[PDB]
């Protein structure tokens, strides 16, 4: 994926307002609630059996912060997502055994979280730019699978 200069500007402007301590835990929690089969990868988190248990789980929050920090790193290298994420792609394949289809689900939920948090500011053109971003990140994270 490649973004036009206007899309890059819109992505970067919105992201500068994203709360680093919160959006990641919200997105990861919603992934686990909306698509509960994804809980298979997170047994060590403990009880994930209700929305309240997931959303308040401190390990969900801490892990989501790391996931979104890596996402933030990708936004600093939008022309080189595959290179930027190659080590993490290898990790998710070789060590974590994560089906990359899950990366697309997390992108779905992240877009919903941005829309929920920002409201009307998350316009249809801003969403379209973020859809390119989350697709690019998912594709980059899938790239070193074999």
């Amino acid at each position: 994926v490649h973004l036009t200069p206007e899309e890059k500007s819109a992505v970067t402007a919105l992201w500068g307002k994203v709360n680093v301590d919160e959006v990641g835990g919200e997105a990861l929690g919603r992934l686990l609630v909306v698509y509960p089969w994804t809980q298979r990868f997170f047994e060590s988190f403990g009880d994930l059996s209700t929305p309240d248990a997931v959303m308040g789980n401190p390990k969900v929050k801490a892990h989501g912060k790391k996931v979104l920090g890596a996402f933030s790193d990708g936004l600093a290298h939008l022309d080189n997502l595959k290179g930027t994420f190659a080590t993490l792609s290898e990790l998710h394949c070789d060590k974590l055994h994560v089906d990359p289809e899950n990366f697309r689900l997390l992108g779905n939920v992240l877009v919903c979280v941005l829309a929920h948090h920002f409201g009307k500011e998350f316009t249809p053109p801003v969403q379209a730019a973020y859809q390119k971003v989350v697709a690019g990140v998912a594709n980059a994270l899938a790239h070193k699978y074999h």
Binding site: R30, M55, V111, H116, F118, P124, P125, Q127, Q131
Partner: protein
């Protein structure tokens, strides 16, 4: 299957949407056409510009069908039977596109329902829209 809690959550969220249902349908379509341009292949006869009368009119039809489904959440196959016949025999949209529209409907609801779009309600709405989509593709072959 939609659980009792799913049905409660969907009815509550759609009740909050209220008179905006048609507007949100049109916005979800605009989001879909912009984010997923391949979906435009089904509308070569539409002006797809922002605010077009055809997108507004069609978004109201989508919204009304969803309202019908909410009002008949216990037996959606029967309530949507005529619409599922039309999808299977005439419109013939590839099933993947229903996931794209469903996602854009969730984004639209999220952008307009700050209090109502909780994680639980998000999960229930996703299941509901997938169930509608399943009914609408159930007679394809």
């Amino acid at each position: 299957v939609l659980s009792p809690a799913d049905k409660t959550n969907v009815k509550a969220a759609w009740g909050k949407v209220g008179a905006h249902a048609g507007e949100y349908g049109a916005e979800a379509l605009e989001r879909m056409f912009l984010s997923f341009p391949t979906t435009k292949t089904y509308f070569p006869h539409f002006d797809l510009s922002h605010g077009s009368a055809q997108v507004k009119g069609y978004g109201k039809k989508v919204a009304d069908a969803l309202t019908n489904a909410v009002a008949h959440v216990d037996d959606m196959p029967n309530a949507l039977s005529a619409l599922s016949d039309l999808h299977a025999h005439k419109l013939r949209v590839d099933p993947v596109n229903f996931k794209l529209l469903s996602h854009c409907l969730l984004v639209t609801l999220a952008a307009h329902l700050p209090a109502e779009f909780t994680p639980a309600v998000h999960a229930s709405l996703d299941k509901f829209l997938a169930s509608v989509s399943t009914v609408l593709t159930s007679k394809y072959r």
